[PDB]
């Protein structure tokens, strides 16, 4: 177990497999010299040899070298491995506020690669409508499940607030999926650089022995 801002995070989220925690951090912002800690993020990954193969070209590098190498994080996004994003809400916000932030971030990454048409638009609409109904209480846990291959499942976006049961939603438009993946696992472009620095120190270890 590992605590982030007093929020416990499991070392391994099995029963999903064997995804292991590789990065920890928070989503924050500074408005008028004041830190606003929104979320607590934990990135889980399955440590198969497929990962150590797709990341072998970065073996022996340092955390400061992986951090400046935005291609290492793109190769990490493009790994065919079960992934899990565990975002725990810290500050009470409307679920729509996180929805318009997920849309605008993914839409911009979609327009950059020209991969924005109508198939991506509806898959983005199904996500915004999913979050605008729920309200983020300090304890709610959004969960992104990225299976290893497109054969097994698709992409499961789970919600877990205290009281009600786990509200889940499936998306299969892989364009929006691997842009949400870039939103959390990107280099200098990710939403939580604190989570990125944690992956750098972790991967720099495995990718050294």
Author numbering: 7 to 22, 27 to 219
What does the report in the manuscript say about this coordinate set?
Chalcone synthase (CHS) and chalcone isomerase (CHI) catalyze the first two committed steps of the flavonoid pathway that plays a pivotal role in the growth and reproduction of land plants, including UV protection, pigmentation, symbiotic nitrogen fixation, and pathogen resistance. Based on the obtained X-ray crystal structures of CHS, CHI, and chalcone isomerase-like protein (CHIL) from the same monocotyledon, Panicum virgatum, along with the results of the steady-state kinetics, spectroscopic/thermodynamic analyses, intermolecular interactions, and their effect on each catalytic step are proposed. The production of these value-added products also offers the prospect of increasing the value of the crop, especially because many of these compounds are soluble and readily extracted. This study characterized the enzymes involved in the first two committed steps of the flavonoid pathway, CHS and CHI, and the non-catalytic protein CHIL. Through crystal structure, molecular docking, mutagenesis, kinetic analyses, ITC, and FRET analysis, our study provides evidence supporting a revised catalytic reaction mechanism for monocot CHS and CHI and identified an intermolecular interaction of CHS with both CHI and CHIL in a non-competitive manner.
The electron densities corresponding to the residues from 6 to 21 and from 26 to 219 among each of the 223 residues in the native PvCHIL molecule were resolved. The overall secondary structure was composed of eight β-sheets and seven α-helices. The structure of PvCHIL was very similar to that of PvCHI in terms of both the number of secondary structural elements and the overall three-dimensional structure with a backbone RMSD of 1.21 Å. The area of the largest structural differences between PvCHI and PvCHIL was located at the residues corresponding to the ligand-binding pockets of CHI. However, the corresponding primary sequence for those secondary structural features is not conserved, as the active site is replaced in PvCHIL with the following residues: Arg-35 (Thr-37), Thr-47 (Asn-49), Asn-113 (Ser-115), Ser-190 (Trp-193) with Tyr-106 (Tyr-108) as the only conserved active site residue. Close inspection of the results indicated that the PvCHIL utilized its unique protruding loop between β3a and β3b to bind near the homodimer interface of PvCHS. The interaction between PvCHS and PvCHIL was endothermic with ΔH of 31.88 kcal mol−1, ΔS of 127 cal mol−1 deg−1, and Kd of 76.3 µM. In the presence of naringenin and naringenin chalcone, the Kd was 7.46 µM and 170.35 µM, respectively, indicating that in the presence of naringenin, affinity between PvCHIL and PvCHS is increased, whereas affinity between them is decreased in the presence of naringenin chalcone. As previously observed in snapdragon (Antirrhinum majus) CHS, promiscuity of PvCHS was rectified by PvCHIL, yielding much less CTAL and BNY.
